[PDB]
Amino acid sequence: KNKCVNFNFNGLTGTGVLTESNKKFLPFQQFGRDIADTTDAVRDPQTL
Amino acid sequence: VSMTKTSVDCTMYICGDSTECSNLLLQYGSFCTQLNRALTGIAVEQDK
């Protein structure tokens, strides 16, 4: 967390920082996209 | 009087965290060079 890492969630590659937000994640949502046509937040399938 | 200074890059926006994408971008020539040079002069234009 809090570092410029190379994340890979469900086959989605990219360079970003994994941070913690205040968005209440719904139990059915796996990944949410932003207005810039990119995934803004993902969900860890091992631990919610 | 002035506008919002925003320089849109043609490297990160076209090729988002990719290596083989930059090889095909340089085959077109100086298209990304002349667009970054033109948008740099807009930021000098809004300050002048």
CB contact under 8 A, B16 and A13: no
Pair of tokens at residue A1: 């967390």
Taking alpha carbons only, the member of A41, A46, A36 closest to residue A17 is A41
Q: Which residues of chain B have a CB within 8 Å of the CB of A14?
A: 16-17
Resolution (A): 7.5
Contact B16 A14 (CB under 8 A): yes
d(Cα B33, Cα B9) in Å, to the nearest integer?
Answer: 10
Angle, CA A31 vertex, CA A27 and CA A33 arms, to 5°:
130
